[PDB]
Amino acid sequence: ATFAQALQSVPETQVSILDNGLRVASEQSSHATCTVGVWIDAGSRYETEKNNGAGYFLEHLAFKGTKNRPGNALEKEVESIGAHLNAYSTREHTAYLIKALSKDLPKVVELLADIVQNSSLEDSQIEKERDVILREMQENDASMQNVVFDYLHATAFQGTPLAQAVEGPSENVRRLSRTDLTDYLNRHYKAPRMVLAAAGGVEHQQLLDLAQKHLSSVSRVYEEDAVPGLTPCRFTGSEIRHRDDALPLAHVAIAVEGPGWANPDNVTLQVANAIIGHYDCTYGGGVHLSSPLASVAVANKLCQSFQTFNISYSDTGLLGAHFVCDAMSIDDMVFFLQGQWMRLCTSATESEVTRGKNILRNALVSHLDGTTPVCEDIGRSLLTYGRRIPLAEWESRIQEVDAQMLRDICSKYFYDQCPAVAGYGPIEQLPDYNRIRSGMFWLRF
Amino acid sequence: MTNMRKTHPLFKIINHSFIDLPAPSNISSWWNFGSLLGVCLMVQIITGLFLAMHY
Amino acid sequence: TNMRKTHPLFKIINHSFIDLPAPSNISSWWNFGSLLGVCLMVQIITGLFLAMHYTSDTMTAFSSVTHICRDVNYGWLIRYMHANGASMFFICLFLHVGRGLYYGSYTFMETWNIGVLLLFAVMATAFMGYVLPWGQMSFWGATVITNLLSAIPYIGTTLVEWIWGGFSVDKATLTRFFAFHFILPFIIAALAIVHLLFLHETGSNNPTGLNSDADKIPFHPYYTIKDILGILIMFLILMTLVLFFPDMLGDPDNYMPANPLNTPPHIKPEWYFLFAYAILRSIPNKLGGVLALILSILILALMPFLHTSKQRSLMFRPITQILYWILVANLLILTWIGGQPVEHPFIIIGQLASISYFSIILILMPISGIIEDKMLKLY
Amino acid sequence: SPTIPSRLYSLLFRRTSTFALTIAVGALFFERAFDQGADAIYEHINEGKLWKHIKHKYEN
Amino acid sequence: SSKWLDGFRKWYYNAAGFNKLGLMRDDTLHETEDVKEAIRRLPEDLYNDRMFRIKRALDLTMRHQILPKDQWTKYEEDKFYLEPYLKEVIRERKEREEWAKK
Amino acid sequence: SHTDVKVPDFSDYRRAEVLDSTKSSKESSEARKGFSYLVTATTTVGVAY
Amino acid sequence: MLSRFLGPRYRELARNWIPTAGMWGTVGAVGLVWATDWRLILDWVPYINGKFK
Numbered sequence A: 001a002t003f004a005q006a007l008q009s010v011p012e013t014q015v016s017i018l019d020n021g022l023r024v025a026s027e028q029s030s031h032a033t034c035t036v037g038v039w040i041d042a043g044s045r046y047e048t049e050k051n052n053g054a055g056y057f058l059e060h061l062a063f064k065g066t067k068n069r070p071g072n073a074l075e076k077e078v079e080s081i082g083a084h085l086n087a088y089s090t091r092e093h094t095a096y097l098i099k100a101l102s103k104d105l106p107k108v109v110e111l112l113a114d115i116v117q118n119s120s121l122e123d124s125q126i127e128k129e130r131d132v133i134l135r136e137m138q139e140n141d142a143s144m145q146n147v148v149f150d151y152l153h154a155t156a157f158q159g160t161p162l163a164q165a166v167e168g169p170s171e172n173v174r175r176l177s178r179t180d181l182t183d184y185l186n187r188h189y190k191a192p193r194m195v196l197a198a199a200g201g202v203e204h205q206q207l208l209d210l211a212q213k214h215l216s217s218v219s220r221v222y223e224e225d226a227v228p229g230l231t232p233c234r235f236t237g238s239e240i241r242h243r244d245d246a247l248p249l250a251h252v253a254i255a256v257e258g259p260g261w262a263n264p265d266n267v268t269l270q271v272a273n274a275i276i277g278h279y280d281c282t283y284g285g286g287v288h289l290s291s292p293l294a295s296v297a298v299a300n301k302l303c304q305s306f307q308t309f310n311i312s313y314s315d316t317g318l319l320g321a322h323f324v325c326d327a328m329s330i331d332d333m334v335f336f337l338q339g340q341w342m343r344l345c346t347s348a349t350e351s352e353v354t355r356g357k358n359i360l361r362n363a364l365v366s367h368l369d370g371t372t373p374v375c376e377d378i379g380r381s382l383l384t385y386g387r388r389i390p391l392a393e394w395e396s397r398i399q400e401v402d403a404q405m406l407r408d409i410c411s412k413y414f415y416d417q418c419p420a421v422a423g424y425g426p427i428e429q430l431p432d433y434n435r436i437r438s439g440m441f442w443l444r445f
Numbered sequence B: 001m002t003n004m005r006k007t008h009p010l011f012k013i014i015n016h017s018f019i020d021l022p023a024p025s026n027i028s029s030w031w032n033f034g035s036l037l038g039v040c041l042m043v044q045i046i047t048g049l050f051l052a053m054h055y
Numbered sequence C: 001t002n003m004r005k006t007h008p009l010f011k012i013i014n015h016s017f018i019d020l021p022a023p024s025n026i027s028s029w030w031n032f033g034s035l036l037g038v039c040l041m042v043q044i045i046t047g048l049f050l051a052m053h054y055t056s057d058t059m060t061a062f063s064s065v066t067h068i069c070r071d072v073n074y075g076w077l078i079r080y081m082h083a084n085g086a087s088m089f090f091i092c093l094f095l096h097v098g099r100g101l102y103y104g105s106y107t108f109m110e111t112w113n114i115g116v117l118l119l120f121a122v123m124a125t126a127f128m129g130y131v132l133p134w135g136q137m138s139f140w141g142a143t144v145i146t147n148l149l150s151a152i153p154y155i156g157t158t159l160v161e162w163i164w165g166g167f168s169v170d171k172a173t174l175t176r177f178f179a180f181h182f183i184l185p186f187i188i189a190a191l192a193i194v195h196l197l198f199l200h201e202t203g204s205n206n207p208t209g210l211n212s213d214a215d216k217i218p219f220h221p222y223y224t225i226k227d228i229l230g231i232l233i234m235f236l237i238l239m240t241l242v243l244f245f246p247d248m249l250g251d252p253d254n255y256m257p258a259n260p261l262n263t264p265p266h267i268k269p270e271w272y273f274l275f276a277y278a279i280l281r282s283i284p285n286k287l288g289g290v291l292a293l294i295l296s297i298l299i300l301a302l303m304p305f306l307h308t309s310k311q312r313s314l315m316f317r318p319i320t321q322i323l324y325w326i327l328v329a330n331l332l333i334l335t336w337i338g339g340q341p342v343e344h345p346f347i348i349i350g351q352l353a354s355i356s357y358f359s360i361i362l363i364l365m366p367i368s369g370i371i372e373d374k375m376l377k378l379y
Numbered sequence D: 001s002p003t004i005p006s007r008l009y010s011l012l013f014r015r016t017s018t019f020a021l022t023i024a025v026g027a028l029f030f031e032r033a034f035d036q037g038a039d040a041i042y043e044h045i046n047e048g049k050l051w052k053h054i055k056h057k058y059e060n
Numbered sequence E: 001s002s003k004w005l006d007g008f009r010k011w012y013y014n015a016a017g018f019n020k021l022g023l024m025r026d027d028t029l030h031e032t033e034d035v036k037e038a039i040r041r042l043p044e045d046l047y048n049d050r051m052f053r054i055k056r057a058l059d060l061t062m063r064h065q066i067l068p069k070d071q072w073t074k075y076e077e078d079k080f081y082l083e084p085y086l087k088e089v090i091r092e093r094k095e096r097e098e099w100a101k102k
Numbered sequence F: 001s002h003t004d005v006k007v008p009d010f011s012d013y014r015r016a017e018v019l020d021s022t023k024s025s026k027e028s029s030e031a032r033k034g035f036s037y038l039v040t041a042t043t044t045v046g047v048a049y
Numbered sequence G: 001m002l003s004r005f006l007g008p009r010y011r012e013l014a015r016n017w018i019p020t021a022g023m024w025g026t027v028g029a030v031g032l033v034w035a036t037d038w039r040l041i042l043d044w045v046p047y048i049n050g051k052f053k
């Protein structure tokens, strides 16, 4: 069987629209377990720096009780069937998802009926979640990777709603009140911004009947009739450097502005990342990895680990690399990393393009294994693209990438650009911004 | 692959002295005079070399 | 605490001459390298004491040199040790390059290339210094070799008018040659510093060619007193060559004043150029002769890419030893032929000598290396 | 419309080899223009005094 | 090949002269990356024997002496200890080079 | 807190075309690079002359 | 291409880098005729020929 018709044998996601504008999408497979979730366009980018932690505080409180099921009884409704109830919030998308069995498919929709509609916010829960979130961020600032990524968003998107963290500053956490959470729920938990996704052993018609009978009362109507626009954000080439020499080793991330979701050359950028890839100190290949950055990083013992990311948002994003290493090699890692980017702008040959295409194909198919990743892709794709892209379309878009358009796209996005730098730890040998800006181009080109 | 700036020996010497030399950030215009003395010494060598061709 | 390892100026001297690891089995040939440095200092020092009385003017250059010999206190001593020290400098230089060729020392490619740059610089310095006393042979040798340097079409005539500073060799050429001859040994000294710096990253070679890291000794006190003994032997040879035969290597025709209308019956350079001269006139085409001189001196630069054996030294290669000694014999024959006039049978001997020289360096030594590799059952 | 510095960056200043070619050709044209202009300023400030202004009475 | 080539090999082994310093053939090989890796892959016994033979040869060439004739390395007893390691290193380098070609 | 930090106001220093925070970049970056590299190219031309 | 640079990949590197090397050679030739004031090639252009070098 050829890969194309094997990819065509995957069942298609079925999408339908209620009269509220809420989208309902399902994908059917042969599993005995299903994953049902609600995806809302309500992140930290929709906040106005006085409700900067409203989404995090709400997603803390969302499993603490409704106006019909008071508190822990809701927990029993999840725990007496073995379902796993989960939630997360990015800067743009907020998901409440749950994994259960198929026989419990109606009743569990009931939970997603009243999690996003009839949340009850008791005040004792408000101060309890207030100091829980305070010690949660006091725990989370120890993780240097989250600190570096939040610093990168702070220095890359200065003065924009996309710089602020999902959790927000500590002063708002001690300042969010009941009415502000009510206003956030009224403005952002509306009907046309919500996608009910299901993956696994579900049928689309039964899911539609349950979705109608439960979520037909979601608002669709505005409070003050003022549409919250999702404005463009100004990327700013800059640096931020937090020097703390007591830390054992440093985390450094360098990014440039990338296109987002709607631009198809994102797929080309993914192949570029698949040329450079990732490396960790606990790998197995050694010096014989195909990535030249990883091979030189294990040959000279430069870094503890590095990875490449392509983070996207509405018409914007970040595209770059993040490495943790000891201090004495930091600039050398930068030099080698920058050199790899310049090769992808100048000397891209078909062998590494074929290798990166194969890596992206295998990673893309193997990522969509499991009802929870399939439901995540359905909800995120209908929030971002407005439709679910079948994997055959992804295969057709991948197959059109050769070396010429790869180095064209990489010269567009990487060559002679102003990056955003975020360093944390013993970063004295991290070079000054003029050295990185000089490393963004070659004099031999 | 290596870095020819930090491994080649005379490139290592000029990298230590001229490229990756840690200098204070706040030194004023009075610190330009050492390089001025060096380049004026070089000007004296070159102009005297061309003067001694006919003297 | 100690100044030998912590003081930033004495640390360099300790790293280069005191606690430097050197092979324990290097022969006397290695002393030649230090001898070259000593000759450089000697030349510079003696050159400075010639410069306190030399007058760079075509009317008063020959007269100034005679005034140095006849009226300056011990001025004859300084002039003749400058001349015979140039000769001893070229002797030590030739044996240094022969040591580099025989014991496979050209695999230090950066050291070898800074070496051939040094060789070019000292050949030009000795040329302009020989022009400086402004005798018959100085004027006519300068005119001959610069006029044949002019052989390049559309470029060489403007270059020779620029070098001469006029229609032919005149006072401007003499003064600019004095300035260039004074200033070139300091670029030579700096290039020797870079030469030693490029050497010291990897250490010296040994006559066996093997890794001497199993047995190395400090430079002090062993090679200190060995190079002192070599300096004393060299000063014996040099002072015998000054105090007893002061013009055996010289040319008597340089003792007449430069008459521009008196073409000598023979025109020669000094002996250390003569072999290249015999490669120059071995081809009856001026572009071919000048370019063949350039290849005859730059085949040393081409030498590290003509190495084919899996061994390094010639100590265990008898056929390539035979080819090397045939090459040295051919070089001696080329020197004798360049001394000789352009008559029968010197023209055919010089042609066969240059052909065999280029054939031995270019073709025959890699063939001998691969033959010995096949002979030792490894290829 | 795209601006004049935008077209200059996208067409000439992006690569380094085109940057160097632009610098060389601009140096040629600029030495021609600058030498002619500075020379013309020099005879406009010193009219009737240079030899070129007075090589008409005696040149014949 | 039968009669005198082996005899000429014996005569050339005597004439080259590394046997009278106690060296084997593979001790005389000039180091490259391949030879250094092959030396690095040697076991401890052969490595120590090689390094002792090398420094004994350097001691002998210091004093401009040779070994006594009974201590000269015999042509038949000369073992080629290194060349399987060197051939394996050369083979894997050729594999890496031909992969880098395509 | 790592979320308590934010970049201070650079509106005294940044250029006029990048002053507006609600307008995306990559529309005027070519003009800024062209202006700065035009200054660099013109002083290189003068130094070469 | 001494012994082991012969392959499709180094052919692709050459096809990527000959345009850059050609542009650099154009830079070198223009700099040569600019600095040396060459009589053959600088006498074709209309602008520079006002001073006739």
Ligand SMILES: CCCCCCCCCCCCCCCCCC(=O)OC[C@H](COP(=O)(O)OCCN)OC(=O)CCCCCCCCCCCCCCCCC
Pocket: C318, C319, C322, C326, C329, C330, C333, C349, C352, C353, C356, E015
């Ligand atoms: C098979 C040989 C047997 C020899 C036996 C000798 C007696 C043995 C018993 C007594 C012991 C004596 C001392 C032993 C010394 C070491 C061993 C030995 O004899 O080696 C022979 C020696 C080197 O051996 P190998 O390299 O194999 O010889 C190849 C020949 N080309 O090779 C030689 O000595 C031969 C050297 C010949 C060189 C001829 C050079 C002719 C060309 C010179 C041109 C010069 C330039 C001329 C001008 C050119 C332009 C016109």
Ligand code: HEM
Pocket: B030, B031, B032, B033, B034, B035, B037, B038, B041
């Ligand atoms: C021959 C002329 C001289 C040359 C070429 C020369 C060269 C230099 C250079 C290149 C520097 C480093 C750059 C700088 O700090 O300006 C320097 C610094 C210095 N020089 Fe000199 N120098 C000369 C004369 C002197 C003299 C006469 C003195 C002593 C009075 C002196 C004392 C110093 C000191 C103390 C510094 C360090 C100042 C600092 O670090 O702030 N120099 N010189």
Ligand code: HEM
Pocket: B041, B044, B045, B046, B047, B048, B049, B051, B052, B055
């Ligand atoms: C090694 C390099 C140098 C050479 C070859 C050199 C050569 C000469 C020559 C030939 C002259 C005579 C020309 C004339 O006087 O009109 C001269 C004059 C002079 N030199 Fe130098 N010189 C050198 C370096 C210096 C330096 C470093 C200085 C000090 C800054 C210096 C100061 C002078 C002065 C003051 C004069 C007198 C100028 C005059 O009155 O005309 N020279 N030099």
Ligand code: HEM
Pocket: C029, C030, C031, C032, C033, C034, C036, C037, C040, C093, C096, C097, C100, C103, C105, C106, C108, C111, C112, C114, C115, C116, C118, C119, C122, C188, C192, C195, C196, C199, C203, C204, C205, C206, C300
């Ligand atoms: C200007 C004259 C020269 C000077 C002052 C000079 C100086 C030196 C010195 C001091 C050494 C270290 C001592 C030694 O090992 O002998 C040396 C070694 C060396 N030189 Fe030169 N050198 C000169 C010319 C050359 C030339 C012309 C060449 C190239 C043919 C050359 C190639 C080498 C090499 C290859 C070594 C390494 C010795 C070894 O490890 O076998 N030198 N030189």
Ligand code: HEM
Pocket: C040, C043, C044, C045, C046, C047, C048, C050, C051, C054, C065, C079, C082, C083, C086, C089, C122, C123, C125, C126, C129, C130, C131, C132, C133, C181, C182, C183, C185, C186
């Ligand atoms: C900076 C150092 C040097 C100075 C100032 C210098 C200066 C002079 C002067 C003034 C003369 C002419 C006086 C005379 O001919 O007796 C001369 C001649 C000469 N120099 Fe030098 N010299 C220097 C270094 C050298 C070196 C390194 C060499 C060797 C390559 C050399 C080779 C000669 C030769 C061959 C002559 C001609 C000797 C003769 O009259 O036959 N000089 N030098």
